[PDB]
Amino acid sequence: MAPERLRSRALSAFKLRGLLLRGEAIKYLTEALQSISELELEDKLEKIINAVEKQPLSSNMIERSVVEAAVQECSQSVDETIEHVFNIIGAFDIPRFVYNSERKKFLPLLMTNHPAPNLFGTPRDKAEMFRERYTILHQRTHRHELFTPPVIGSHPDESGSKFQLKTIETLLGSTTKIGDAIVLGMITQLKEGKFFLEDPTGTVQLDLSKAQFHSGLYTEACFVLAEGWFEDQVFHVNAFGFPPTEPSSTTRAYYGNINFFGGPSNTSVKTSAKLKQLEEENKDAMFVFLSDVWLDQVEVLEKLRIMFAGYSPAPPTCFILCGNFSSAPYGKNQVQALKDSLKTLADIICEYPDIHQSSRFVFVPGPEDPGFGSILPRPPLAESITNEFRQRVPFSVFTTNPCRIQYCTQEITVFREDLVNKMCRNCVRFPSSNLAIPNHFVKTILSQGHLTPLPLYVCPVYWAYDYALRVYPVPDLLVIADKYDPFTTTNTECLCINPGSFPRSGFSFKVFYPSNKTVEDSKLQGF
Template sequence: MAARGRIVKTFKFHGLSLQSESSRFLGDVLSTVNVKDIDEWLDRIIESIQNNIVLSSTSIGKDLVVNAVEECSEGSEEKSDNVFAVIDAFEVPRYEYNVDRKKYLRDTINDFHLHPTASCKAKFYQDRYMTIYQRTIRHELFAPPSVVTHPSQKTNKYELKPVEYLLGSTAILGKLIVLGMVTQIKEGKYYLEDPTGVVPVDLSKAKYHTGLFTENSFVLAEGVYEDGEFHVEALGCPPSEPSQVTRNYFGNINFFGGPSAVALKTSTKLRTIEEDNQEAMFVILSDVWLDLPKVMAKLRVLFNGYASVPPTLFIFCGNFISKPFGSKHSWKLRECFNDLSDLISEFPSLVESSRFVFVPGPQDPGPGNILPRPALPSCLTQRMKSKIPFTFFATNPCRIQYCSQEIVVFREDLVNKMCRTCIHLPKDLENIPSHLVKTIISQAHLAPLPHHVRPVYWNYDNALRIYPVPDLIILADKYHSYVQPTSLDCTCVNPGSFSKNEYSFKVYWPASREVEDSKIQD
C-alpha cells in the first residue's frame, strides 16, 4: 500500500491522476524493482506518457500505463547493449519546449523538407530563444526567490524584462536586463529582438564581457531605455549549465539521438565498461590531405605506430584534398580514398579492432555549402567501406555516443567567421579559444552566425544545437590547435590542421577524459 501511495502521489505532483486499475497494475510492476530505483522508473514512465501521447484528460487509464512500461523496459534493454553509435545530423531528434508544461516534448512530424516555407525560419529562431530563455530564468541570478519572509532574505538579484515591457512603458525606467537577439534590421543600426518585439539599441558605451558577440546571437543586455532607444551599458552571454542540471529538470530524455529510447548518461553498465577500458583512445585528425604523398607517408607512420595498440576510434575530418581540382575533384577524391583503404589494409589489427569516422570539410563534395552537410557520396567511398568494415562516413556535424559519453564533431573554420562578424572584437586575442567556447556553449549552438555567413537548413537547425552540453566537442578548425576545458564537465578540442601544422593531432582518453597533444616527427 505504501508503494501505491507513493505512485499516486508522484503522478499527482505532475498534474496527473491514476485510475484505480492503473495504480494496481503499476504497483504490481514496481513491486519487483529495487526500492532505490522506484523514483527513477516512475519519472521515466511519466515522461513516456507525457512525451508520446496527446492527453485529452489528466486521468490516466491502464492502457497508457502498459504502453509506457513496455517502452521504458525496451529502453532499459537498449541501454545495456548500445556501446557505440555514430548519429547522422539529419536523424537528431527534435524537441520543442512547451511553456505551459515547462517540459520538452518530442516533435512527431516526420515530413521535414530541406526547403520549407518562411514560417520555419521564424520558428527555429523562436526555438533557439526558448532554449536559452528557460535555462536563464532557472539560473540562480534570475530565478524568482522561494518563500521570502523578510526583504533581507531576497535571493534573486536580477529580473529579465521582455522587449514589449520597454516599448509599452510610458514611465521612466531604471536599469533593465533584456534577453534578446542582436540583429541589424537597417544597415549600420543594431536592434535587440525577442518574440515580443524589436527595440533599437545604442552600443557606443557598452562594456563587453567574455564572448564573441555576432549578429543573430542571443545576449543579456543591461541598460536604460530612454527616448525610444535602449542604451546598453553591459553586454554578456546568457548563463549556461552542466548537462546534469538540465537532466535533473527534464529527466532522461534522449536529446542527443541514437538507437536508445532514453539517454545513456545514467547507465551504470555502460559507465562500468567505460571505466574498465582504460586503454580506449580516440585519435583525432583534421585537414587530412590525401592527395599529398607526404601526408600519406605520415599516415603510414601513424598506423604503424598504433598497429600494436589499436585505438578504439580514428576521427578524420576534411578537407580531404589540398586544393580544388575542378571537374576532376570527385574522381581525384575517390582515388585518394582507394589509396587510403589499401594503406589501412596493410595493418590487420587496425582493420579488426579500430573504427574509422570521416567527417567532410567545407571544400569536400556536397550539395552546396549549407549545414548540416550530408556524408560523402557512396560512389566515392564504396571500396573503402568494402575493405574496412568498421568505417563510417558521417555528416557534418555528427554525433558519436561512446558508452555514457556524448561527443559532437564539427568541421568548420569557425574562429575566422566568428571574429570577422563580431560587433566587438575582444582585446585579448590570445584568448580567442576561450571566448569562442564560452559563446557556443552559452548559445547552445555550434554556429551562432548570420545566415549569409553560415547558411543552415531551417528544418535541421536542431542538429547544430548542443543542449544539454555534451562531454566532448571537437571543433576541427584551420586555426591553431587548442584544448579548452570548461566548468561544465565539457571539453572543447581543436586538433588543428594535420597537413599544415607539422602533422600534429590529438588523442582523447575516454576513461580519464584527458586530451593529449601528439605529433609525427620527421
C-alpha cells in the same frame, strides 16, 4: 521436458503478467526453453518476461522478434560488444524535440503537431529557427539564480537577485528612463550603425555607446542580456552579457535524463550503471581525431602510414578523420582523387590488418569537399566515391557534418568548419585580449548553445534541421575542427578541442581517452 506442459506453463507465465504470445513467439520460446527443467524453468521464464517488459512494447501482443531479443539478452551475446558501446549518429537522425512552454517540458515531435523536418522548409520554419533558439536560451535563463525570491524569501522585496528580466514589448510603454532594465534578445545591425535588439515580442534600438562587456566574442545574431535603460524608442545599454551556461548535470536534474544527445538509448547515456561499467571495461579505451586530411597528397598518405606504425601498439577503437580531405577540392578532378585517396587508404589499412580489425574509421566531410558541402547539416560524402571503401573496409562509416559520436556514457560532437574566422569577422565589439580567442569562442558557443551563432547567410542551414546544430545540454566533447589553431579548453564538464588542420599543424593531431576523459597530443611532427 514435455513439450505440451512446457508450452502450457510458458503461455501461463506470460498470461499472468498480462502478455499474449503469437504462435511463432511461443514456438520459438518452447524451442529455446526445451533444455531446461523445473529447477530453473520458472526463474528463466520470469527473467525473460522481465527482459520482454524492459523493451519498448507497443501492445500486449508479442511478436517473435521481441522474445528473440529477450532470450538472447538472457543468453548474454553482448560480450565485447560494439553496439550500445559506440555509435555514430548522423545529424538527420537526431531526435527533434520541441520545448512546450505551458507544460515546461521537451516533447518529441510525434507527441506534438510539429511537422517533420525537410530541406524545402516553409516561410514559418525560417523564423522558427531563431524563435526556438530564443526559447531554449529563455528557459535556460529563467532557471538561474536571477529568478525572483520565494514567498517572503526576504523581508524586503528583491529584484531577482538584482537581475530581474523583461521582454521588449513590456518596456515599450511607461518605463521611460527606468535605470534597471534587463532584456534577453538578439543583436542585429537592423540599420547600418544603428543596432537593434529583437526577441519574439518585438524590436528596439541599441545605443551601445558604452558596452562594459563581459568576456566572450560578440557577433550579430548573438543573444545577450542587455542591461540598460529605455528612452525615445532606444535602449541605452549599460552592459552586455551572455546568458549563463548550465552543466548537463543541472539540465538533466531539472528535466530528467532525457536523451537529448540522441542514439539508441531512451535515457541519457550519462546515467546508466551497466554502461558505466562497459565504459571502463577497457582501461585504455581510446580514440584518435584528425582534420583536413589531404589524402590527394602523397605526403599525407605516407605520414598516415607512419601514424599507423606509431599506433600499431594500443590501437584506437576508432579513427576520426574530419573533412576538407583535399589540397584541391575543385570538382571532377577531386572526385577521382578522393576515389584514389580511399583506394590508397584501403591499401594502407590492409597493410596493417591488426589496426583494420581493431579500429574503425569514420569521416566527417567539410564544406569544400565534393557534394552538398555549402549548406548544413551536410550529407555524407557521395556514396559513389565511397563504394570501393565500403566493400574493402567494412569497418568504416562515412557520415554527415556535424555528426554526434557516443562512446558509452559520454557525448562527442564533431563539426568541421573554419568558424573562428567567421565569428571574428562578424564581430560587433572587438574582444579584450586578456582572454585567449579559443576560450572566447568556446565560451560564446557554450553560452549561445549553438554551433552556428551567426546570421544565416554566414552559416547556411536547412531551416527545419537547425535543431541539429544546437549545443544543448553541454556534451563531453566539442570537437570543433577548424583551420585556425589546434587547441584544448574546458568549461561546464566539457573539453572543447580543435584537432587543427593536419597539413598546417605540422601533422599534429589529438588523442582522447574516454575511460578517464583525458586528452593527449599526437605531437608526431617529425613523423
